[PDB]
Paper text:
Archease is a small (16 kDa) acidic protein that is conserved in eukarya, bacteria and archaea. Here, we show that Archease and [name] from [name] do indeed function in unison, and that Archease affects the catalytic properties of [name]. Archease expands the cofactor specificity of [name], enabling the efficient use of dGTP, ATP or ITP.
Archease crystals diffracted to a resolution of 1.4 Å and contained four protein molecules per asymmetric unit. Archease appeared to crystallize as a dimer of dimers; however, sedimentation equilibrium results were consistent with the existence of a predominantly monomeric species in both the presence and absence of Mn(II). The structure of each subunit consists of two strand–helix–strand domains, each consisting of a three-strand core and a single helix in a strand–helix–strand configuration. The crystallization buffer included CaCl2 and the omit density map showed two Ca(II) ions per asymmetric unit, with each Ca(II) ion bound to a single Archease subunit in octahedral coordination geometry. The metal-binding sites are identical and consist of two strictly conserved aspartate residues, the C-terminal carboxylate group and three water molecules. The Ca(II)-binding site resides at the base of the N-terminal protrusion on the protein exterior. The electrostatic surface potential of Archease is dominated by regions of negative charge.
Author numbering: 1 to 143
């Protein structure tokens, strides 16, 4: 037989997606999804808070920036987060996001650690108002 080769389909990273009644709630929800890649997010208690503020020229960059700062907090302080309060406004020609992130220190016995997220990316990123008036935010982070 002559040697032969092929490509085949396999999972590549993982998709995260949030839905909400508002853009802000979709951002909150997809951030929960992000932490559920790393731990069982349902096991994360709200003991500590960190605040985020970022500006961007468009909503995609805003979402990237928000999630990447959450990842950085996670990487530096070892915090994991359960929920978020997000506010998005227009200020002097930019989008401004402010958020409160609620969570606690990683607990290896309790949080059911899964896999770390290496980086937020723009891969498959989409933010949209669906025909039914709900909002969706998604992306495929690098794991
Ligand atoms: Ca990867």
């Amino acid at each position: 037989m002559l040697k032969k080769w092929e490509h085949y389909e396999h999972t590549a990273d993982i998709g995260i997606r949030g839905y909400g009644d508002s853009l802000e709630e979709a951002f909150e929800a997809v951030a929960i999804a992000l932490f559920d890649v790393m731990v069982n997010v349902n096991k994360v208690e709200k003991k500590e808070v960190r605040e985020i503020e970022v500006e961007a020229e468009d909503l995609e960059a805003l979402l990237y920036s928000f999630l990447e700062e959450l990842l950085v907090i996670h990487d530096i302080e070892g915090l994991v987060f359960r929920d978020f309060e997000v506010k998005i406004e227009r200020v002097n020609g930019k989008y401004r996001l402010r958020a409160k992130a609620y969570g606690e220190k990683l607990d290896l016995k309790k949080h059911e650690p899964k896999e770390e997220v290496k980086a937020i990316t723009y891969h498959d990123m989409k933010i949209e108002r669906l025909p039914n008036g709900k909002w969706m935010a998604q992306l495929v982070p690098d794991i």
